[PDB]
Amino acid sequence: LSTAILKQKNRPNRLIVDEAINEDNSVVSLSQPKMDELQLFRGDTVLLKGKKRREAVCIVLSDDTCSDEKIRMNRVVRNNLRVRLGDVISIQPCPDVKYGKRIHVLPIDDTVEGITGNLFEVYLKPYFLEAYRPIRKGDIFLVRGGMRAVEFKVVETDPSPYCIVAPDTVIHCEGEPIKREDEEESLNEVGYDDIGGCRKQLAQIKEMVELPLRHPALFKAIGVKPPRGILLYGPPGTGKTLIARAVANETGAFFFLINGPEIMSKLAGESESNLRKAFEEAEKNAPAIIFIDELDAIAPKREKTHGEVERRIVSQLLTLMDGLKQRAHVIVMAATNRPNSIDPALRRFGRFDREVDIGIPDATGRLEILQIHTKNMKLADDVDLEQVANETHGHVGADLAALCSEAALQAIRKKMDLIDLEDETIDAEVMNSLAVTMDDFRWALSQSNPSALRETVVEVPQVTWEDIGGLEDVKRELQELVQYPVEHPDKFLKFGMTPSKGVLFYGPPGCGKTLLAKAIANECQANFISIKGPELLTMWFGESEANVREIFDKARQAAPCVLFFDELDSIAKARGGNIGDGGGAADRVINQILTEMDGMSTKKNVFIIGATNRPDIIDPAILRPGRLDQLIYIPLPDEKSRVAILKANLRKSPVAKDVDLEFLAKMTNGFSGADLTEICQRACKLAIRESIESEIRRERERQTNPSAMEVEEDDPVPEIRRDHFEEAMRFARRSVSDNDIRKYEMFAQTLQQSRGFGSFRFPS
Amino acid sequence: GFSGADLTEICQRACKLAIRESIESEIRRERERQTNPSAMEVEEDDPVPEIRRDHFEEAMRFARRSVSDNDIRKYEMFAQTLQQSRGFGSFRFPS
């Protein structure tokens, strides 16, 4: 009674698609109580619901021979409802039993060719002769009243929803031959489910948009104000105009597209007229959506604006923007690659206040995009899309389409040997028997250049607590700072504590200090932004203090993050390590991290994790309360963490079943966490090499005796095969010597040994 | 010899030992009562409502003196030098 018009009219009596063998285009096989629930009498026509208001109706007959769970239909109505078999369809009567005054069905000649005559007497007679055939205004029904499939395109129907077109009222023969090529122009209206990798942000766009659009009365009544404009932004080609078309085509709202260059390419003084005639025409129509695409072209930073007419379109845009108020019920959205590349006068309140962020798709978004872009190809059975989605690590929503196109072209190319050089009469199997293999996808992947290799990736990591193993104390002391302030925030209000906002790991170099950040980020399902040393040290060699702000503001729009500043000591040891000229702590970059860290309220759930190998040169201005507070010393793996590390590195490589990792982890004693990832690779080359060697030597010896005929040898080495490790152990070094351990173990007892009041006891 | 900002980690680290306990004594109770899901007598009003001394007994085990006694000398040997450069004392106007 407060939250219930929010449904899309889902019904208990939904009938699911069931195949039929009939040729009548308006016969329905319904459940037996279908005439009974709503007391559906005979003599009317029901209103079946598909999508995008692109539907197709039937004449509802007392033919209830089907079952109680599904509906049996032909291709005609279910497909002309613009829904495939697998879309929900509502059943509901429509009292619009009307007779067509002047209709307009558009034939296609190839289906019509043969007998032509006059359209009326030759085709409208044997089709409309009281044949139980009502339509919906604007469809293309399929005619099985001949030997072959024939479609006529409905355009005009005097009743607005639809009617039972009858010959009793005159029917014009003004239909005209159309072509199959014209379907995509109407299918420019894109359904909702044709977007992948955006299930996280599309929810935000929905909650912002449909509630203001499909329920104006609630907003006008309660008085809460819908947004005056969204501002999507992301790397180019992630399919944003498609998002706008989806959002405005599945909510029933007129859509108007303003291109960027198309405005900035007309005569000086004519573009502004186009902007006015766009914002004017939109407000006249229904609740609309203006999508000002490529906004950083008609409104760059001022530092690009140099002409006067270049700065008059911006003013016209601002005037039209703030001219919007609640009367018009119009909503605007934009698109730019990076938020700060827009004129700052636009973000002021009332114009583009709120700002969604489409990002690079993540490991499952790529799978969804691939499954969308390969729903037409004839993939071979050996295809594995969950595989190819895994290694494409820079691609965006447009690169994957090109990749699939390239694989299809490669299949065509391998078919060209048997294709005649002048094969205009391309044979049926040459058009249909095509099958793309993993050979093709790996080839095309190797021949693709990713478009987005240089953007910080914000996605939940997959490494879990079972890889590191051990480290029991760190597990708890890292839960209680990243998970508790997220899963139980009210406990932090029952008492008065403010959550911590920092940790500082320090340990021997290369000892799984990164895997702990990813593990804890994987626990609480939090994003994970990694900043590497070779990146901060770039900032120290030029501009600073203009990108750290942007890093933090990126982490803010994706809470809860676990921002991981790797090698906080990079600048400090790249400046002298107690530099000779004098410079003590400040380095123009860490200072900026401080300035941003303090100016960030704890309510936002952003936790900053550092990691250093030289935990004394680190600036003493960060180890102060209110900033990175404590220090956790990550020791070398002891006995169980080594077993887990070995079993984590040896997962993708088929290992022998008689290998004793419990022994190999018991002899390797002071080994780091990064010299057990070497033993588990140098023990692969010793099996790779012995594989190519024996392959080549067999191909040799067989050619020595070609008449030997001896064939069908399966494989000489499928397996890492112990007595490989027994050799890879001969090149196994130790990263950190003992003196490099009693250097940190003698720093812990410097942070320690200034404590120890545990003798404290409350008297009585 | 405790600073004004080392008594604010005997007063927080004495609360992360209550947040811990009241967030364990909750979760532990969930798994407990699945032994008797039909008991219908569950949900004690408060397992730990209170900072509850014997926490400061423990939080005092991670109390670190920030300013060592060898660094508080550099100041007391300054302010004492602003004095001893003063004191005209027996100054007294005639009659």
UniProtKB/Swiss-Prot annotation, chain A:
Claim: Ubl conjugation is one of the keywords in the record: yes
Effect of residue 174 to K: In CMT2Y; normal ATPase activity; impaired autophagic function
Record PTM: Phosphorylated by tyrosine kinases in response to T-cell antigen receptor activation. Phosphorylated in mitotic cells. ISGylated.
Outcome recorded upon mutating residue 240 to Q: Impairs ERAD degradation of HMGCR and does not inhibit interaction with RHBDD1
Effect recorded for residue 306 to A: Does not affect methylation by VCPKMT
Covalent cross-link Glycyl lysine isopeptide (Lys-Gly) (interchain with G-Cter in SUMO2) as placed by the record, residue numbers: 7
Pfam families the UniProt entry points to: AAA (PF00004), AAA_lid_3 (PF17862), CDC48_2 (PF02933), CDC48_N (PF02359)
Localization per record: Cytoplasm, Cytosol; Endoplasmic reticulum; Nucleus; Cytoplasm, Stress granule
InterPro entries noted in UniProt: AAA+_ATPase, AAA_ATPase_CDC48, AAA_ATPase_domain, AAA_lid_3, Asp_de-COase-like_dom_sf, ATPase_AAA_core, ATPase_AAA_CS, Cdc48_dom2
Modified residues (Phosphoserine): 2, 26, 451, 691, 759, 764
Organism: Homo sapiens (Human)
Protein name, per record: Transitional endoplasmic reticulum ATPase
Entry-annotated residues carrying N6-acetyllysine: 491, 494, 657, 743
Annotated consequence of substituting residue 180 to Q: In FTDALS6 and IBMPFD1; abolishes enhancement of K-304 methylation by ASPSCR1
Annotated binding of ATP 1, by residue: 236-242, 337, 373
Record annotation: effect of changing residue 144 to S: In IBMPFD1; impaired autophagic function
Task of the protein: Necessary for the fragmentation of Golgi stacks during mitosis and for their reassembly after mitosis. Involved in the formation of the transitional endoplasmic reticulum (tER). The transfer of membranes from the endoplasmic reticulum to the Golgi apparatus occurs via 50-70 nm transition vesicles which derive from part-rough, part-smooth transitional elements of the endoplasmic reticulum (tER). Vesicle budding from the tER is an ATP-dependent process.
Family affiliation: Belongs to the AAA ATPase family.
Result for mutant: residue 303 to A: Does not affect methylation by VCPKMT
GO biological process: aggresome assembly; ATP metabolic process; autophagosome maturation; autophagy; cellular response to arsenite ion; cellular response to heat; cellular response to misfolded protein; cytoplasm protein quality control
Keywords: Acetylation, Amyotrophic lateral sclerosis, ATP-binding, Autophagy, Charcot-Marie-Tooth disease, Cytoplasm, Disease variant, DNA damage, DNA repair, Endoplasmic reticulum, Hydrolase, Isopeptide bond, Lipid-binding, Methylation, Neurodegeneration, Neuropathy, Nucleotide-binding, Nucleus, Phosphoprotein, Transport, Ubl conjugation, Ubl conjugation pathway
Region of interest (Disordered), residue spans: 697-716
Outcome recorded upon mutating residue 144 to C: In IBMPFD1; also in one patient without evidence of Paget disease of the bone
Gene Ontology MF terms: ADP binding; ATP binding; ATP hydrolysis activity; BAT3 complex binding; deubiquitinase activator activity; identical protein binding; K48-linked polyubiquitin modification-dependent protein binding; lipid binding
